[PDB]
From Swiss-Prot, chain A:
Signal sequence annotation: none
Subunit and interaction comment: Component of the DASH complex consisting of ASK1, DAD1, DAD2, DAD3, DAD4, DAM1, DUO1, HSK3, SPC19 and SPC34, with a stoichiometry of one copy of each subunit per complex. Multiple DASH complexes oligomerize to form a ring that encircles spindle microtubules and organizes the rod-like NDC80 complexes of the outer kinetochore. DASH complex oligomerization strengthens microtubule attachments. On cytoplasmic microtubules, DASH complexes appear to form patches instead of rings.
Function: Component of the DASH complex that connects microtubules with kinetochores and couples microtubule depolymerisation to chromosome movement; it is involved in retrieving kinetochores to the spindle poles before their re-orientation on the spindle in early mitosis and allows microtubule depolymerization to pull chromosomes apart and resist detachment during anaphase.
Protein name: DASH complex subunit DAM1
Superkingdom field: Eukaryota
Shown residues within the full chain: 53 to 107 of 175
The organism's taxonomic lineage, starting at the top: Eukaryota, Fungi, Dikarya, Ascomycota, Pezizomycotina
Location of this chain's protein in the cell: Chromosome, Centromere, Kinetochore; Cytoplasm, Cytoskeleton, Spindle; Nucleus
UniProt record similarity statement: Belongs to the DASH complex DAM1 family.
Length: 55, 56
């Protein structure tokens, strides 16, 4: 009754929040895959060094 | 007959000489470049594993 356009503004704000949160979710997943590849990469690198540590 | 065989030998010599020199010069220069490339390559990877050892 009193906050009709106010709640419309809230609807817009939550829509923007949904957009930013989707970008966060997506980009964090992207970085998760990135980090996992580089983690397993250097992991196995350490494993090879951990097994046959050169002179 | 005699000189026919002499020049037969000479023609074979010179023919295969041109072939061998082509082989020699071209592939030698090429392989020298390849050698230095492989040198720097293996050295870089060697140091990579060196740093991995220090990482351990």
């Amino acid at each position: 009754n009193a906050f009709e356009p106010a709640f419309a503004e809230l609807a817009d704000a939550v829509a923007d929040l949904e957009a930013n949160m989707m970008h966060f979710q997506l980009m964090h997943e992207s970085l998760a895959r990135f980090s996992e590849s580089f983690a397993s990469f250097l992991y196995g690198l350490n494993m090879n060094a951990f097994c046959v540590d050169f002179p | 007959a005699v000189k026919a065989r002499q020049l037969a030998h000479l023609h074979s010599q010179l023919t295969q000489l041109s072939h061998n020199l082509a082989t020699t010069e071209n592939l030698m220069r090429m392989t020298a470049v390849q050698a230095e490339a492989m040198r720097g390559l293996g050295s870089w990877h060697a140091g990579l594993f060196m740093a991995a050892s220090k990482v351990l």
